[PDB]
């Protein structure tokens, strides 16, 4: 048994930021996709990976406006089982694909700057497409779990669609995404550190172009660690609270649950941030 | 010089197994598709198997499907045919034919020498009405071959090949696609005709022309040969 | 809807396509250098350390370098230069001992100006080699550098070789925002004349990879 | 001596006077009532892929179905235009190739470039592969064009200011035509294979006769190099393309210039020219990635073959005038119609 | 040198003694040839797609 209650504080605050992020991400990703499909006549492995990131990050907005329906009756959802079942799956799939493709891009840069002669730096678009499809399948498999059977709570809304609620369990959600934040963070930080140390050691940073490249490399990691960090700490707090410390009392868990979603709010800030960090702000178009 | 030498023939008991090898020397064996063609004791030719360049395509006759296997080894320039569960109807003299397919090419240029195998104890039907034709040197002769289905493809090509086999020798290509003349053939030979009716004409006949003439199709891959017309005197 | 011969022809075409692709992939992993000079300016020595076109292949640290020498072409240089548009580096050989004979250094400077500012070589780094160091020192011991550079004003010592010679040759690239010039003194026997080329080529390749990535 | 100073000048003045006195009218005045051809629209009917570097030349087969293309990647490919299949892919010994040719009989092909050697390859062999039939040497400069007189003869021009007619079997220089003052950049053979013209970086064209091996006429008028030249199907006129963004039509019999095709919006230099089967169109490939189609009798543009992303390096028209093949530096050949 | 000048003058003298015709006649001949073969030029007059080898 768990609580999954609805607070009055959420309604006044969240819907504004979700709406703003939805609009910003939609417009930015649309512009990026148009640019890539129209003016990107030349396609390379890095371009393919960036396009995949753009597609994955855009995919969230097919359902982002839909969750906005919770505005009217606080914790309200006027849809059936499957209509809400698809939304959560799409959100999780896209969020996981974003991280996977960020890590892939970082590793590609590391291989392109530290081992410049490695054959991996020259791969035909076919291999890039195969790897992209394999990663897409991996994320789809990782994010497919009982799409429709169990996502409803019932009380004031027949379907109080809650996934990352404060409910003791070891299921896929609430448990696994911590690795998705840690291991990719480690890979990205190590790759960026090696790239920025090798570039500086051989004194090729005299040109302003290398300075801009280093600045953006550090940016990417900063953005990742500021966006996807807070939710992990809130989840760790929840795990610690589960073991003793006033267990079986939702009164204390109210503030922690509040924190959970007012922190998830940032998780979609990537949708509008990445648009400029990767596709724009670079001397490629 | 270009040559194919083949071996692996002899007495065999019914239900046994055997292997035939064909070694090619003098040409780029890696760029030539290879056919295995049978010839019964005293009857017409018959197609037995085909292996393409790079081993990306293999075809078998309906009479030996699943019973024979055909393989090629480019590095040592060899062609292998493995036969299993032989029957009394498999006694023949197997050949080894080459063919390269590209625009303007000529299939079936060179024929092997032949290995004799003895076993103790929808398809287009090409027809050749005549069987014996007595001819004296200095005159002209005509040989007629008919097919069950029109051989004129949409491309405008008409796949119809004319082969000649002298006594005690392997067949040699004479005409390919009913008009072209195979390299090295004298200009006397000519071919003509429309779909479903073809003719081959020889103007001046010399002593070195007596033999057996065969007409083959190349439209549908279950290749079929004619009964064969022989010239006497 | 194709005859047997047509299908066989298509198969042959696909095989030829595969072979062409494999050969192109193999040939795209090699470093190409174009060697230029003012004549008998140590080119033969540099080639020794490692009709028409003369190609020289060599290997270093699992890298394959192909060096193209065009010394035998007496025709106009503006009609076949664009062939060498994809080269990854232009080795340039100059002799510091030619500042006295005849003026020759002025000819080398003119050739460097013509090549470095060409339309096609607007993005290819230049590796500059200065040869005959010992002979140049021996000659400057007695002859002054003012014979070739009247505007020069400095002491007559080899320490002024890096001044007013390297500076003069590095001052001709009027597009300094896209290409870089690496200068390295050499002599008859150094054993490091191939390491410098390796470092320059590694820098150029890193820049190319970063540019292709879009970072950049 | 004074002879070179005065005799040459007075002979040049006499030539100019003779040319002027034999100009009753101009081609534009005569062809004023001819109805304009009208807009010409051509669409890319085939695109041929497989080259991995710039394409520098191509030649149509005599049967108007097979063509040959040469690139800097070291391959010489033979395409079947109707189906786009590949028939042969010859790997060259030297990858600096700047020309190619197809024998009229379809047996041999030829190529050459910065190596100063003309390689002749034989296609119809009993072994089934393509092997170097012969290598012709004796040019002291890069070879820029080569054409087949027949299976046993070939004429080549190089950046040495000379042309040479060879003898493939023996391999020697049967004849040497000299007289230019700069690199010879292209030549074309007359329909009857009795005379041929060459254009040079001297900014002039010359008309040699193969048999006697001697210059017969010199045509001037350009202001820069000449990068292409082609005969008029009639065999009594040829069109030249230069680096000053202008084509010209010269007439052999009148020994003069007839018309100049130029436009203000065009500033780039031409790389290749060709005629149509009836001689009423003149296709010219420019350096700005386009390819224009001029009304040969009126000098009015009638279309544009804009389909390439880089320089148009080679251009050809089939023997029966049913297609136009253009090969560009982006490693692509396109067959229009 | 002397040989070069002699060669040049001889070439010019040889080339300056060829018969010439009025430009109008040559223009008329070119126009007549262009008009005569109008019907045999597929590019000039488009051919029906039925008998176009490169169709599609
Ligand atoms: O992306 C997830 O995994 C997810 C999304 C949600 N919601 C919306 C939300 C909350 C903070 S940021 C976005 C609640 C919801 C969504 C559809 S119906 C109810 N929870 N978990």
């Amino acid at each position: 048994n768990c609580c999954v209650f609805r607070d009055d504080f959420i309604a006044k605050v969240l819907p504004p930021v979700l709406g703003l992020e939805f609009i910003f991400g939609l417009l930015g990703n649309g512009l990026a996709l148009w640019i890539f499909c129209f003016h990107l006549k030349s396609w390379k492995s890095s371009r393919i990976f960036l396009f995949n990131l753009a597609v994955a990050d855009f995919l969230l907005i097919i359902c982002l406006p839909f969750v906005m329906d919770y505005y009217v009756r606080r914790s309200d959802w006027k849809f059936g089982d499957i209509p809400c079942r698809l939304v959560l799956f799409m959100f999780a799939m896209n969020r996981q694909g974003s991280i996977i493709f960020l890590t892939v891009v970082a590793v590609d840069r590391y291989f392109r700057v530290v081992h410049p002669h490695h054959a991996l730096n020259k791969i035909s678009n076919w291999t890039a497409a195969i790897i992209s499809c394999l990663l897409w399948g991996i994320t789809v498999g990782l994010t497919v779990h009982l799409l429709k059977k169990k996502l409803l709570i019932q009380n004031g809304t027949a379907n109080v669609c809650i996934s990352f609620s404060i409910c003791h369990t070891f299921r896929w959600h609430e448990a696994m995404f911590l690795l998705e934040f840690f291991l990719p963070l480690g890979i990205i930080l190590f790759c960026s550190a090696r790239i920025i140390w090798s570039l500086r050691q051989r004194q090729m940073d005299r040109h302003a172009k290398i300075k801009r490249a280093i600045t953006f490399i550090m940016v990417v990691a900063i953005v990742f660690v500021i966006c996807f960090l807070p939710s992990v700490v809130v989840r760790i707090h929840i795990f610690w609270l589960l073991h003793t410390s006033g267990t079986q009392n939702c009164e204390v868990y109210r503030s922690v649950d509040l924190a959970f979603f007012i922190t998830l709010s940032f998780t979609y800030m990537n949708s509008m941030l990445d648009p400029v960090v990767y596709y724009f702000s670079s001397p490629s178009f | 010089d270009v040559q194919l030498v083949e071996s692996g023939g002899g007495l065999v008991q019914p239900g046994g197994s055997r292997k035939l090898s064909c070694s090619a020397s003098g040409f780029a064996f890696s760029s030539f598709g290879m056919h295995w063609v049978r010839q019964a004791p005293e009857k017409g030719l018959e197609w037995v198997a085909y292996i393409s360049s790079g081993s990306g395509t293999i075809y078998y006759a309906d009479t030996v499907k699943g019973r024979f296997t055909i393989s090629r080894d480019d590095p040592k320039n060899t062609l292998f045919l493995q036969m299993t569960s032989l029957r009394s109807e498999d006694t023949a003299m197997y050949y080894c034919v080459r063919s390269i397919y590209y625009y303007g090419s000529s299939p079936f240029d060179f024929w092997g020498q032949g290995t004799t195998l003895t076993v103790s104890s929808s398809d287009i039907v090409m027809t050749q009405a005549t069987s014996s034709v007595p001819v004296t040197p200095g005159e002209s002769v005509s040989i007629s071959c008919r097919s069950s289905k029109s051989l004129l493809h949409s491309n405008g090509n008409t796949y119809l090949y004319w082969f000649l086999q002298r006594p005690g020798q392997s067949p040699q290509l004479l005409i390919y696609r009913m008009s072209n003349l195979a390299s090295g053939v004298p200009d006397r030979f000519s071919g003509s005709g429309s779909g479903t009716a073809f003719t081959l004409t020889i103007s001046r006949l010399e002593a070195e022309d007596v033999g057996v003439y065969y007409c083959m199709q190349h439209l549908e891959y279950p290749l079929t040969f004619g009964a064969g017309t022989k010239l006497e005197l | 809807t194709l005859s047997a011969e047509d299908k066989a022809a298509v198969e042959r075409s696909k095989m030829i396509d595969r072979n062409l692709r494999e050969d192109g992939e193999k040939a795209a992993r090699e470093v190409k250098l174009l060697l230029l000079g003012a004549g008998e300016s140590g080119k033969s020595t540099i080639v020794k350390q490692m009709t028409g076109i003369v190609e020289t292949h060599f290997t270093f640290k699992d890298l394959h370098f192909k060096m193209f020498d065009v010394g035998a072409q007496r025709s106009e240089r503006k009609k076949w230069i664009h062939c060498f548009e994809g080269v990854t580096a232009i080795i340039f050989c100059v002799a510091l001992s030619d500042y006295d004979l005849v003026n020759r250094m002025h000819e080398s400077m003119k050739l460097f100006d013509s090549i470095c500012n060409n339309k096609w070589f607007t993005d290819t780094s230049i590796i500059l080699f200065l040869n005959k160091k010992d002979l140049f020192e021996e000659k400057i011991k007695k002859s002054p550098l003012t014979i070739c550079y009247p505007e020069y004003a400095g002491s007559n010592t080899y320490e002024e070789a890096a001044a007013y010679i390297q500076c003069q040759f590095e001052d001709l690239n009027k597009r300094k925002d896209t290409k870089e010039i690496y200068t390295h003194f050499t002599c008859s026997t150094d054993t490091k004349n191939v390491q410098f080329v390796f470092d320059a080529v590694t820098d150029v390749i890193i820049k190319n990879n970063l540019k292709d990535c879009g970072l950049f | 001596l004074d002879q070179l100073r005065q005799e040459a000048e007075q002979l040049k003045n006499q030539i100019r006077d003779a040319r002027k006195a034999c100009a009753d009218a101009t081609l534009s005045q005569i062809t004023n009532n001819i109805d304009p051809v009208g807009r010409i629209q051509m669409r890319t009917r085939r695109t041929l892929r497989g080259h991995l570097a710039k394409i520098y030349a191509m030649h149509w087969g005599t049967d108007s179905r097979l063509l040959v293309s040469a690139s800097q990647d070291g391959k010489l490919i033979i395409w079947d235009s109707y189906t786009t299949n590949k028939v042969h892919a010859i790997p060259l010994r030297s990858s600096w190739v700047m020309t190619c040719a197809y024998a009229p009989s379809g047996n041999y092909v030829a190529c050459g470039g910065l190596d100063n050697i003309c390689s002749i390859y034989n296609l119809k062999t009993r072994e089934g592969n393509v092997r170097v039939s012969r290598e012709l040497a004796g040019h002291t400069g890069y070879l820029s064009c080569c054409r087949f007189l027949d299976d046993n003869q070939i004429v080549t021009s190089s950046g040495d200011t000379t042309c040479a007619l060879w003898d493939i079997e023996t391999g020697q220089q049967t004849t040497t035509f000299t007289g230019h003052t700069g690199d010879v950049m292209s030549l074309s053979l007359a329909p009857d294979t009795r005379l041929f013209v060459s254009g040079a970086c001297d900014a002039s064209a010359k008309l040699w006769d193969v048999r006697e091996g001697m210059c017969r006429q010199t045509f001037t008028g350009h202001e820069s190099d000449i990068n292409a030249i082609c005969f008029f199907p009639n065999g009594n006129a040829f069109a030249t393309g230069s680096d000053d963004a202008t084509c010209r039509l010269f007439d052999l019999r009148a020994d003069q210039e007839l018309m100049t095709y130029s436009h203000d919006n065009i500033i780039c230099g031409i790389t290749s020219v060709s005629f149509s089967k009836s001689g009423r169109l003149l296709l010219a490939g420019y350096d700005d990635f386009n390819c224009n189609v001029w009304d040969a009798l009126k000098a009015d543009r009638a279309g544009v073959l804009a389909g390439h992303d880089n320089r148009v390096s080679c251009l050809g028209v089939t023997d029966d005038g049913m297609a136009v093949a253009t090969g560009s530096w982006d490693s692509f050949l396109k067959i229009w119609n | 040198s002397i040989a070069q000048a002699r060669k040049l003058v001889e070439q010019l003298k040889m080339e300056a003694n060829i018969d010439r015709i009025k430009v109008s006649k040559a223009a008329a001949d070119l126009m007549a040839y262009c008009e005569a073969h109008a019907k045999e030029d597929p590019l000039l007059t488009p051919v029906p797609a039925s008998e176009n080898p490169f169709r599609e």
Side-chain angles (χ1 to χ4, degrees), chain B residues 76-88:
Chain B
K76 338 165 301 299
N77 287 11
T78 313
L79 186 71
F80 296 109
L81 181 131
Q82 175 87 245
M83 324 159 31
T84 61
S85 172
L86 300 206
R87 299 196 296 271
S88 172

mmCIF file of all heavy atoms in Angstrom, chain B residues 76-88:
data_model
loop_
_atom_site.group_PDB
_atom_site.id
_atom_site.type_symbol
_atom_site.label_atom_id
_atom_site.label_comp_id
_atom_site.label_asym_id
_atom_site.label_seq_id
_atom_site.Cartn_x
_atom_site.Cartn_y
_atom_site.Cartn_z
ATOM 1 N N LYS B 76 42.102 -22.221 -55.577
ATOM 2 C CA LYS B 76 42.793 -23.237 -56.359
ATOM 3 C C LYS B 76 42.135 -23.489 -57.708
ATOM 4 O O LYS B 76 42.547 -24.408 -58.423
ATOM 5 C CB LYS B 76 42.899 -24.553 -55.579
ATOM 6 C CG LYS B 76 42.773 -24.438 -54.058
ATOM 7 C CD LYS B 76 42.529 -25.789 -53.376
ATOM 8 C CE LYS B 76 41.264 -26.494 -53.846
ATOM 9 N NZ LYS B 76 40.052 -25.692 -53.557
ATOM 10 N N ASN B 77 41.129 -22.696 -58.078
ATOM 11 C CA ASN B 77 40.501 -22.775 -59.395
ATOM 12 C C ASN B 77 39.977 -24.188 -59.664
ATOM 13 O O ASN B 77 40.453 -24.902 -60.548
ATOM 14 C CB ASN B 77 41.486 -22.349 -60.490
ATOM 15 C CG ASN B 77 41.742 -20.858 -60.498
ATOM 16 O OD1 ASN B 77 41.359 -20.145 -59.575
ATOM 17 N ND2 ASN B 77 42.397 -20.377 -61.548
ATOM 18 N N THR B 78 38.984 -24.584 -58.869
ATOM 19 C CA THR B 78 38.396 -25.907 -59.019
ATOM 20 C C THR B 78 36.884 -25.832 -58.872
ATOM 21 O O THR B 78 36.350 -24.952 -58.194
ATOM 22 C CB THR B 78 38.972 -26.894 -57.999
ATOM 23 O OG1 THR B 78 40.400 -26.784 -57.983
ATOM 24 C CG2 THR B 78 38.589 -28.316 -58.357
ATOM 25 N N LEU B 79 36.199 -26.771 -59.521
ATOM 26 C CA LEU B 79 34.748 -26.885 -59.464
ATOM 27 C C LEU B 79 34.390 -28.313 -59.083
ATOM 28 O O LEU B 79 34.860 -29.259 -59.720
ATOM 29 C CB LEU B 79 34.124 -26.515 -60.811
ATOM 30 C CG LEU B 79 32.601 -26.457 -60.882
ATOM 31 C CD1 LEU B 79 32.074 -25.258 -60.130
ATOM 32 C CD2 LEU B 79 32.152 -26.418 -62.328
ATOM 33 N N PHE B 80 33.565 -28.469 -58.050
ATOM 34 C CA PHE B 80 33.236 -29.772 -57.492
ATOM 35 C C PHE B 80 31.749 -30.049 -57.640
ATOM 36 O O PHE B 80 30.918 -29.156 -57.439
ATOM 37 C CB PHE B 80 33.613 -29.849 -56.011
ATOM 38 C CG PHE B 80 35.083 -29.724 -55.750
ATOM 39 C CD1 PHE B 80 35.599 -28.582 -55.168
ATOM 40 C CD2 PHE B 80 35.947 -30.752 -56.079
ATOM 41 C CE1 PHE B 80 36.947 -28.465 -54.924
ATOM 42 C CE2 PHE B 80 37.297 -30.638 -55.838
ATOM 43 C CZ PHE B 80 37.799 -29.494 -55.260
ATOM 44 N N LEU B 81 31.419 -31.293 -57.979
ATOM 45 C CA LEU B 81 30.039 -31.761 -58.008
ATOM 46 C C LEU B 81 29.960 -33.077 -57.252
ATOM 47 O O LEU B 81 30.585 -34.064 -57.653
ATOM 48 C CB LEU B 81 29.539 -31.926 -59.446
ATOM 49 C CG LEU B 81 28.096 -32.402 -59.599
ATOM 50 C CD1 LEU B 81 27.340 -31.532 -60.584
ATOM 51 C CD2 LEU B 81 28.077 -33.841 -60.057
ATOM 52 N N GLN B 82 29.202 -33.086 -56.161
ATOM 53 C CA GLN B 82 29.048 -34.253 -55.301
ATOM 54 C C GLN B 82 27.711 -34.912 -55.611
ATOM 55 O O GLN B 82 26.660 -34.269 -55.509
ATOM 56 C CB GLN B 82 29.124 -33.845 -53.829
ATOM 57 C CG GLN B 82 28.850 -34.962 -52.828
ATOM 58 C CD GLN B 82 30.094 -35.750 -52.478
ATOM 59 O OE1 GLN B 82 30.199 -36.936 -52.784
ATOM 60 N NE2 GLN B 82 31.047 -35.091 -51.830
ATOM 61 N N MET B 83 27.753 -36.188 -55.981
ATOM 62 C CA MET B 83 26.570 -36.960 -56.329
ATOM 63 C C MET B 83 26.348 -38.033 -55.274
ATOM 64 O O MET B 83 27.293 -38.726 -54.882
ATOM 65 C CB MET B 83 26.719 -37.600 -57.713
ATOM 66 C CG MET B 83 27.471 -36.752 -58.734
ATOM 67 S SD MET B 83 28.163 -37.687 -60.112
ATOM 68 C CE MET B 83 26.989 -39.023 -60.264
ATOM 69 N N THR B 84 25.104 -38.167 -54.819
ATOM 70 C CA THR B 84 24.735 -39.132 -53.795
ATOM 71 C C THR B 84 23.511 -39.914 -54.244
ATOM 72 O O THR B 84 22.627 -39.369 -54.908
ATOM 73 C CB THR B 84 24.437 -38.443 -52.463
ATOM 74 O OG1 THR B 84 23.340 -37.539 -52.628
ATOM 75 C CG2 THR B 84 25.651 -37.674 -51.974
ATOM 76 N N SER B 85 23.463 -41.194 -53.875
ATOM 77 C CA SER B 85 22.329 -42.062 -54.185
ATOM 78 C C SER B 85 22.103 -42.145 -55.696
ATOM 79 O O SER B 85 21.049 -41.779 -56.219
ATOM 80 C CB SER B 85 21.066 -41.577 -53.467
ATOM 81 O OG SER B 85 19.927 -42.296 -53.904
ATOM 82 N N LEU B 86 23.119 -42.642 -56.393
ATOM 83 C CA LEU B 86 23.045 -42.765 -57.841
ATOM 84 C C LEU B 86 22.021 -43.818 -58.243
ATOM 85 O O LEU B 86 21.747 -44.770 -57.509
ATOM 86 C CB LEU B 86 24.410 -43.136 -58.418
ATOM 87 C CG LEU B 86 25.570 -42.173 -58.163
ATOM 88 C CD1 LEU B 86 26.600 -42.314 -59.265
ATOM 89 C CD2 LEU B 86 25.099 -40.733 -58.057
ATOM 90 N N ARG B 87 21.453 -43.635 -59.429
ATOM 91 C CA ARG B 87 20.520 -44.577 -60.024
ATOM 92 C C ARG B 87 21.042 -45.009 -61.387
ATOM 93 O O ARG B 87 21.945 -44.393 -61.959
ATOM 94 C CB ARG B 87 19.123 -43.961 -60.155
ATOM 95 C CG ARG B 87 18.499 -43.562 -58.830
ATOM 96 C CD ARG B 87 17.005 -43.329 -58.969
ATOM 97 N NE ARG B 87 16.703 -42.204 -59.845
ATOM 98 C CZ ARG B 87 16.585 -40.945 -59.443
ATOM 99 N NH1 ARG B 87 16.746 -40.604 -58.176
ATOM 100 N NH2 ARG B 87 16.298 -40.005 -60.338
ATOM 101 N N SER B 88 20.456 -46.084 -61.915
ATOM 102 C CA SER B 88 20.912 -46.618 -63.193
ATOM 103 C C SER B 88 20.710 -45.635 -64.335
ATOM 104 O O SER B 88 21.293 -45.821 -65.407
ATOM 105 C CB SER B 88 20.186 -47.926 -63.506
ATOM 106 O OG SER B 88 20.481 -48.363 -64.820
#
